[PDB]
């Protein structure tokens, strides 16, 4: 560890690693700090689901997720426990228990909001779904020129997609995937298009997908090394970044105050360029700790001078969920090309197809897989092979269906894992809404309570807006009920429901992007630079100022690439 | 990865790590293979609970545990789901689903039994409780000389305790720990002693304990290196070990069959010495897959010729659990030295005590801690400080109370963490019973069903022996109800219950030790050498042939230490 | 029709459940493996609790039930009395 | 006839129930029979069902019915947690 780098990056998630990739590559002296630690194995910041053991027990990985989602603001509990023994100590009031947040209104919270503090952040557990936003969901990068704005986004997404190894072909050979994808394509003929979810992942075998992460973007090894002898990069885990120090003029950052968690010592680090990519919650916390915006419960009598839109216009997506059990008709359509005779397990039992026949509904690879499973496992009443991969289906956001969809099997299950129904039959449904940015919807930080790292306690003041947001959220719910029904009836224990506000972890707009700080009520410009500040940049979904339903990360990355370009154009690397 | 090694060790758990420490240190060329992969961070095989994040968020670690406990034998499920939509495909029978084990009788199972496949094994998540066994639970290392037996065990235990860094004072400054322990010793009026659970751990600060693990025993770094230039060690993760090749006379092992899970390739690896430390389940599986004992459902009247006691006499402990809410009486006593005036939160309120007053029931440092908490947080109605450590109390197994006890807070929570009751009030109780070895209690492996790694499927045939084991189990439950009531009544939602059989993961006796293969119905001698084989040693809790209630790992390690002494006496390390 | 139920409509679910006796309960196959070791424990899923060994659990009307009180089920019914249109009607 | 524990955290004035009922095609395979060995509590032959909702129009309509309740109920408000759309026991 030196005291002077060219660039300091706060956060080793995939957005901090986008900045590391671009700047370590362009030959800057780069430092990166994460409050969390290295755990994912020898590949630093890698996806935790890439072990052989998880690929053979996909059902277990829900635990890894839950292990690293630390709630952001837990309100005070008011459940009444009146079956305590008379000898047991019993409250007189509903006092602040268990580090809960006294500032938090329970009825205006994002209870499901949570943060991950591990090297590689949330990209160590994420689903890897990486769709682009269409214009309606998307911030403008060029005004008064739609083709040029389209042009700019298409170049940035293509590069981002490249970093993530995004693709749409990894599940092309799955029976469940094709079955579900097929039905939907037919039921919505002329109304909606379906495709495989664009996934940041590369298939290595029929039973192993290598999921992308921050590690895929930047491998997080210290440089130089044999492989990159001309590069300079250091990662510093177990270091809390607490403040960036403003000059009085509010035109530069002077240093980064860090707290080393192992030794306990606090240090000041100098950079030319300061990049904050600590997540949509923790960027904002860090800026408010540094004198931006306002600390404490909002006071509209006294709005802040510096960055007054900070932690206002926050957006979170509504999320609906269910599971279905495959319809008998769909199960039967799996074997529509077969001539089946006799009874399974009985001497006369016969399953045949004509390869290549004109009347066939399925390709041969399909019918070969089904015929062999049906003949070789006559104890099993289904035509789907045991290790057939799950579906990965979406119909993407459009004006007539303004929500994102994911259909398949997500590793983030929400209830106890049920065993009485065959997993081959189960399909998950997650629809995500777009939330209108409104000034009243706030992420603020307490001037009295602190969190576990002795930083001001995050508090939400949030309701989904009563108008179009709420109407769309309910229409979205009905749409999932309508659509899922095409595949099968609901699985009991996983009936259609809205998830806890924020469980979906797509918070944006906490440090929002736009052209003009005042006119567009924002905090950063289109180079991701904090207005007024020559050398302070924010990356992540906190930048995204629009109402979006699709998963944000690729859009964030896309903004971070544009932001690296401005840095390469305006700061010179130190000579070796 | 070479053709040939002095020693190969299967399994990188703490026991395999005991062999690596001893044999690498003694100059042998050591290879160690683990089916799982590196995932504890840069300290290979280290406890996953040693992150700052987990020590600030101890309730989340239950998820890390659950994520890596993969159930051993799951029977076929027979739950009726009759609220499916009429359109959903519906079972006509309870067919084999979701990888269940059709050999498994659901009513003679250890359903809670589970395995961990990661480098460092279960030591990456364990509670680090390392009690010694008293004579009554301890297998003999010397017959007919209780003095030499004792001194042998004292010496092996003292060594294992330093390897693990066991100690008994890391929690001595907790108010809760002391409140609970003092009240118990008062109430038992001499009949039983309460102490700190001996813990493999080192305290680093008032808020961080470096838990021990495999890595504390042996750091698992490849060697030679700068810190050990004369040593020789390679770890090969993601390598499934499948067979040891016996010579036909059953007097030696010739090679070990391995499957490289990344490349898919298979190799036979040669060494002078072969050490199986794959766990109590997997050592037996590997051995059975190699022609020892009997593959398939046990057949009485066909008995195996080679190690006929392998997989018989299995033991698993009964585990009872509850939590309590601390008594008003105990909460009042924490503050018994205080003069308290006025009402909390008024300008009038004050809490004082006299330091050094001879009538004080508590030391100054306690009273200081209570005073500060009570004066600095007058919103809080409890006298216990916010990050006061949990209790870590035990009364150790004895003949008139033949079960091990642990009282405090265990990371491995068994239901949803409740938020209505303050955590400072909650104390956990786990009592562990001892199970008679009986021949009918079997771990065996299917000759038709295979597991996730294509190895014969583990199947249990187990009931708690009627008679002593079962009478003690129930007296144990009653003892927990009786003892726990001294501290507080039960916490609703954590009422006194037996846990699922084998949830406690203290399986023993699957490859058990004894003097004489026939007379003692066993598999390994007191050097942990498999009878008749020059160069095959088994390590782990599977060696332990006795009825025990204490946590078995320190004992298993002590035996390994004895086994390594045999090795250094009978194999020369190769020239460097 | 009592004053007390008209003032506590929420309670009347209990009167209903009190007089719906299941018609055919199949044999239970739930596995209770946290019984104490001293407690008597089945070796098989035998016919318990008057359940019906003849009943296929997967081809049942489990929710079917009968009321044996004077006035039968009309002592608790919802009183909804629509006519069938031709398509529903004999 | 409520089906789950009575919830109190939401005002009863806001709660609306939805029950949609399907028509079932009569099929010969769907039977109510009586055991010649087991008896019920009045020493009469034990009722046994052999029943599945017919795979064709009955089942299609039942699922369309479910979707119809989801579509229609939405006009009034969102689902109450603990009373999410579900098929009741047959
Ligand atoms: C957890 C989760 C997340 C996503 C999906 C599923 C689940 C279970 N699936 C997924 C997501 N997004 C996608 O677009 N597609 C989907 O398939 N999920 C969200 C996604 O995972 C995030 O949007 C993404 O990582 C955001 O990246 P980022 O902006 O780089 O932020 P991270 O949270 O990954 O990393 C931040 C980081 O910095 C640290 N930190 C925080 N505060 C500090 C301070 N004060 N000092 C130092 N370091 C700090 C963290 O520890 C962390 O590593
Ligand atoms: C999970 C757990 C277990 C312990 C406690 C708490 C919980 C939640 N706490 C506890 C324990 N015991 C104590 O003595 N005190 C306590 O506080 N727990 C049990 C303890 O953790 C085990 O007894 C101990 O690890 C056993 O050590 P081991 O004999 O070294 O075996 P492990 O299972 O840890 O490691 C085995 C290992 O080998 C692998 N494996 C399995 N099969 C193969 C094959 N075929 N090839 C290659 N490698 C194989 C594993 O992947 C593993 O790492
Ligand atoms: C319980 C229930 C029932 C109905 C609704 C709600 C609930 C909770 N709501 C309702 C109904 N039907 C409507 O059209 N609209 C709705 O709003 N429910 C059903 C309705 O309640 C029944 O369809 C109706 O009573 C049928 O009348 P029934 O054909 O007269 O049959 P009952 O079951 O009322 O009375 C039969 C009767 O005879 C007895 N019994 C049975 N076996 C014997 C023998 N062997 N010996 C002598 N007596 C016998 C009974 O004890 C009973 O009183
Ligand atoms: O709740 C899980 C969901 O979380 C979201 O963060 C992801 O973007 C989705 F892919 C995922 O299915
Ligand atoms: O189930 C958790 C328990 O599991 C056991 O393996 C441990 O030995 C105990 F320490 C622990 O409390």
Author numbering:
A (entry chain A), B (entry chain B): 43 to 618
C (entry chain A): 92 to 181
D (entry chain A): 454 to 543
The publication says:
In this context, Trametes multicolor pyranose 2-oxidase (TmP2O; EC 1.1.3.10; for a review, see) is of interest since it can oxidize both β-D-Glc and β-D-Gal to the corresponding 2-keto sugars, which are intermediates for production of D-fructose and D-tagatose. TmP2O is a homotetrameric enzyme produced by lignocellulolytic fungi and has been assigned a role in lignin degradation. The reaction catalyzed by TmP2O is of the ping-pong type involving a reductive and an oxidative half-reaction.
The H450G/V546C variant combines the two mutations H450G and V546C, which individually promotes Gal turnover. However, the overall Glc-to-Gal selectivity ratio for the V546C mutant was increased relative to the wild type. At the structural level, we define the productive binding mode for Glc according to three main criteria: (i) the sugar is oriented for oxidation at C2; (ii) the substrate-binding loop is in the semi-open conformation; and (iii) the side chain Oγ1 group of Thr169 is pointing away from the flavin N(5)/O(4) locus, i.e., it does not form hydrogen bonds with either N(5) or O(4). In the H450G/V546C mutant, the selectivity ratio with O2 as electron acceptor shows a 27-fold preference of Glc over Gal.
